[PDB]
Design a protein around this ligand. Structure first.
Ligand SMILES: [Zn+2]
Ligand SMILES: [Zn+2]
Ligand SMILES: [Zn+2]
Length: 572
């Protein structure tokens, strides 16, 4: 009931009862809130409500202190101060941007912009409010009761009347009833459970609405610049394999936190693991939001770091298959590999946060809150994909607004830039370099002469709002008959439904651009499917085409992005 003012820290008894997070506000700031927002309920030890029997006045602006008690204009005794006077609200110990965060629905880009240009304590209020709003939206969707069980991977679903139906992709994970987490794909729907259970008729699912704990730690601890490598002990014996990164490893030791922008295939994983071999005594916690990013860092560690000082942290509520080849849940091993939402309370000489474009400010805060560390290293690329903002429907979230790390990488620049792509044919490296990296990404590899583009708008059908372009898959099928080297290709599109159709007609393995991020394939077939803002997003486009080691076929809908592709054009 007595805490700190989320805007000026000042001690106060005053929470806003109208904010969903109920932040402590100081008298000077609590006024400036209630006098310019629909937010009028103020909380103290007791609520600022008229104390007269059967009176319903709760608006702080219509209330007075009557002795030690609160009354409205109609019930106040002659000797009474108004609670709102001279720019203050009476409490104990006696904002434009705070007002916009407190009252916004988080459906506009400008909301996320402001949640990332604001002060550091307001970034935490913002991140808390957003996540709370995100969760209380999941309740708004309808329950799914099973009508008929076809098989071991298909069923027919009965949806609740009046309440909307959530998108049926891998992004929306249901909880069955506690018969374990479950996902769906498109009257026959494809059902995939985190447990192998006899999925009964009349069993039901609901989206796992989790309780939003409060944030305490900043997104970014304050910066500290040192004169010498602090708390770390470098080798003089460092294998030539990691010689490129020695100057960057010494930057990491002479600062509190460092930022690494590594475009696709520029040696992020290599740099992360190479940090351990350069500071061989140092205890390192490797963390990312997804299980895939943490498992990728594990594969790289398996190759270069001793398996007996590596532990993969797996939360008891197991949701996906994880990296098996380390000791599981040994928190005190020199090398710990853990998703942000499973991080234990511990310390470390270096923390490496990877896939930073996928981190929210909520994730950036949790990390600083569970790990106390000499050095924090932030690895990713603001030109790759952000965490999905399920509430955002209006405006596009630019990369400088993804999180505080990406804002730093986009404003003042990253500390370290890996500038040579070793993965992609020059045609792909030259294209993305001009598109998202201001011509600063360089091609190691030669032009493959296996990078083709076809401008083919086709026909767009829709499985609800997820898009399909059968003619674009038809063009692919025709290409494959003449190009049997591509039979091994991964099919990629911005749409699950397009992928579903492509799986059946082509037989190729299938990835959404978003699920493809971090992965690499010899040959890639990309159908843009539509020319919407989703499919023309330059970040998503950048990821789509940089998955390819040898060849790529791009069937394009967008004249703009088609023209920019420095690929051999095809006909038909
Ligand atoms: Zn409020
Ligand atoms: Zn204040
Ligand atoms: Zn009253």
């Amino acid at each position: 009931a007595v805490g700190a003012c989320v805007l000026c820290n000042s001690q106060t008894s005053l929470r806003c009862g109208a904010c969903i997070r109920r932040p402590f506000l100081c008298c000077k700031c609590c006024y400036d809130h209630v006098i310019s927002t629909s937010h009028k309920l103020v909380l103290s030890v007791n609520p600022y409500v008229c104390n007269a029997p059967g009176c319903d006045v709760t608006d702080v602006t219509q209330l007075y202190l009557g002795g030690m008690s609160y009354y409205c204009k109609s019930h106040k005794p002659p000797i009474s101060f108004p609670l709102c006077a001279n720019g203050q609200v009476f409490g104990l110990y006696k904002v434009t941007d705070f007002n916009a965060i407190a009252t916004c629905d988080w459906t506009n880009a400008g909301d996320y912009i402001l949640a990332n240009t604001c002060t550091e304590r307001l970034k935490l209020f913002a991140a808390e409010t957003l996540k709370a709003t995100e969760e209380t939206f999941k309740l708004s969707y309808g329950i799914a009761t099973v009508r008929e069980v076809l098989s071991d991977r298909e069923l027919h679903l009965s949806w609740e009347v009046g309440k909307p139906r959530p998108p049926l992709n891998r992004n929306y994970v249901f909880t069955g009833y506690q018969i374990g987490e479950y996902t769906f794909e498109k009257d026959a729907v494809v059902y995939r459970g985190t447990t192998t259970y006899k999925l009964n008729v009349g069993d039901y699912f609901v989206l796992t609405s989790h309780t939003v704990m409060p944030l305490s730690a900043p997104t970014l601890v304050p910066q500290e610049h040192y004169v010498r490598i602090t708390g770390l002990y470098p080798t003089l014996n460092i294998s030539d394999e990691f010689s490129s990164n020695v100057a960057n490893y010494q930057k990491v030791g002479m600062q509190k936190y460092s930022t690494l922008q590594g475009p696709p295939g520029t040696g992020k994983s290599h740099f992360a693991i190479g940090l351990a071999l350069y500071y061989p005594s140092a205890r390192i916690v490797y963390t990312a939001c997804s299980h895939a990013a943490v498992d990728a860092l594990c594969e790289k560690a398996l190759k270069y770091l001793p398996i007996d000082k590596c532990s993969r942290i797996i939360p008891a509520r197991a949701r996906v298959e994880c990296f098996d080849k380390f000791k599981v849940n040994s928190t005190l091993e020199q090398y710990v590999f853990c998703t942000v939402n499973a991080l234990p309370e511990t310390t470390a000489d270096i923390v490496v946060f990877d896939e930073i474009s996928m981190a929210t400010n909520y994730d950036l805060s949790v990390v600083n809150a569970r790990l106390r560390a000499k050095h924090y290293v932030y690895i990713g690329d603001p030109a790759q994909l952000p965490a999905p903002r399920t509430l955002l429907t209006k405006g596009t979230l630019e990369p400088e607004y993804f999180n505080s790390v990406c804002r730093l990488m986009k404003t003042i620049g990253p500390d370290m830039f890996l500038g040579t792509c070793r993965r992609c044919p020059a045609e792909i490296v030259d294209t993305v370099s001009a598109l998202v990296y201001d011509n600063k990404l360089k091609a190691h590899k030669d032009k493959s002469a296996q990078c083709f583009k076809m401008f083919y708008k086709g026909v767009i059908t829709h499985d609800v709002s997820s898009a399909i372009n059968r003619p674009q898959i038809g063009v692919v099928r025709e290409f494959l008959t003449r190009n049997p080297a591509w039979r091994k290709a991964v099919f990629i599109s911005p749409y699950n439904s397009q992928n579903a159709v492509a799986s059946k007609i082509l037989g190729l393995p299938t990835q959404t651009v978003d699920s493809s991020q971090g992965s690499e394939y010899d040959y890639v077939i990309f159908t843009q499917t539509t020319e919407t803002a989703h499919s023309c997003n330059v970040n998503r486009f950048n990821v789509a085409i940089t998955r390819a080691k040898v060849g790529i076929l791009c069937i394009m809908s967008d004249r703009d992005l088609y023209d920019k592709l420095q690929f051999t054009s095809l006909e038909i």
